[PDB]
């Protein structure tokens, strides 16, 4: 997605579990995308170095 699931869900603004879903989305987004693609980038970067 490049942006987490949030473009590929129902809108979570319904009252039940809104904040629960939002921490879920943002935690998923942050952790997997930025940290692990950065791990990959840094690995080949350190390889050239």
């Amino acid at each position: 997605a490049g942006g987490g699931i949030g473009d590929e869900i129902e809108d979570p603004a319904g009252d039940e579990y809104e904040l629960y879903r939002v921490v879920f989305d943002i935690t998923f987004f942050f952790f997997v995308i930025v940290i692990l693609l950065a791990i990959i980038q840094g690995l080949i970067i350190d390889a050239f170095g």
């Binding site: 904040l19 629960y20 939002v22 921490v23």
Partner: peptide, 23 residues
């Protein structure tokens, strides 16, 4: 752990160990 007052009065221990506002 209680919606509106979740981060505040529902769980202050984890709110102090970390500082989240949605759990």
């Amino acid at each position: 752990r209680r919606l509106t007052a979740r981060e505040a009065a529902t769980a202050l221990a984890a709110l102090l160990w970390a500082v989240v506002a949605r759990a």
